[PDB]
A paper describes a structure:
The venoms of marine cone snails constitute a particularly rich source of peptide toxins, known as conotoxins. Here, we identify the sequence of an unusually large conotoxin, Mu8.1, which defines a new class of conotoxins evolutionarily related to the well-known con-ikot-ikots and 2 additional conotoxin classes not previously described. The crystal structure of recombinant Mu8.1 displays a saposin-like fold and shows structural similarity with con-ikot-ikot. Functional studies demonstrate that Mu8.1 curtails calcium influx in defined classes of murine somatosensory dorsal root ganglion (DRG) neurons. When tested on a variety of recombinantly expressed voltage-gated ion channels, Mu8.1 displayed the highest potency against the R-type (Cav2.3) calcium channel.
To elucidate key structural features of the SLC superfamily, we determined crystal structures of Mu8.1 from 2 different crystal conditions referred to as Mu8.1_38 and 59 at resolutions of 2.33 Å and 2.1 Å, respectively. Each protomer of the Mu8.1 structure comprises 2 regions. The first region comprises an N-terminal 310-helix (310N), followed by 2 α-helices (α1 and α2), and a 310-linker helix (310L). The disulfide bonds are found primarily within each of these 2 regions. Within the first region, the Cys18-Cys34 and Cys22-Cys30 disulfide bonds connect α1 and α2. Further, the 310N-helix connects to α3 through the Cys10-Cys51 disulfide bond. In the second region, Cys61-Cys71 links α3 and α4, and Cys57-Cys89 tethers the C-terminus to α3. The dimer interface is characterized by both hydrophobicity as well as the presence of a water-filled cavity surrounded by the polar residues Thr36, Asn47, Thr52, and Thr56.
Author numbering:
A (entry chain A), B (entry chain B): 6 to 89
Amino acid sequence: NLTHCRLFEFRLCLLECMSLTLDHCYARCTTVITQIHGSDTNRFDCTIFKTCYYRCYVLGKTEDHCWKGTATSVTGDVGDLEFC
Amino acid sequence: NLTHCRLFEFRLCLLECMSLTLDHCYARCTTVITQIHGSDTNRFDCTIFKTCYYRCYVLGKTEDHCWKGTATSVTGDVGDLEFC
């Protein structure tokens, strides 16, 4: 499960950070979320989910649909990096 | 470039954490390094390199070769995850 990843939170932080036109929002939110909730949010399978969603966005430039597709399909296993 | 990523530090922390037989060293090391140096170590390209290196390691379980192979051929572009 990706419960402890606090992924919805990262999504809101990411959208809000970019509304401020801050650089490297992906880094800032990971740091912010780590400082509050720690290692649970940096598990490699959280990283896989975030990379599927964030790659989709830098390339697809939707966010709305990139979250739908990731949250419904990507579970965090190492294999997901090449169909997501 | 990937200098701000402090990747060799992460590589040493992971090796140290694993030699102690602790679980979730990728998370713990990402976390401690975050608490110490911050968002520059969590930029999306650092995550690309870390994923190529760590994926090569869970699948093949070599480490030194996965490190050398990733260090020489991965620069952090979003397109690197196709051939790590």
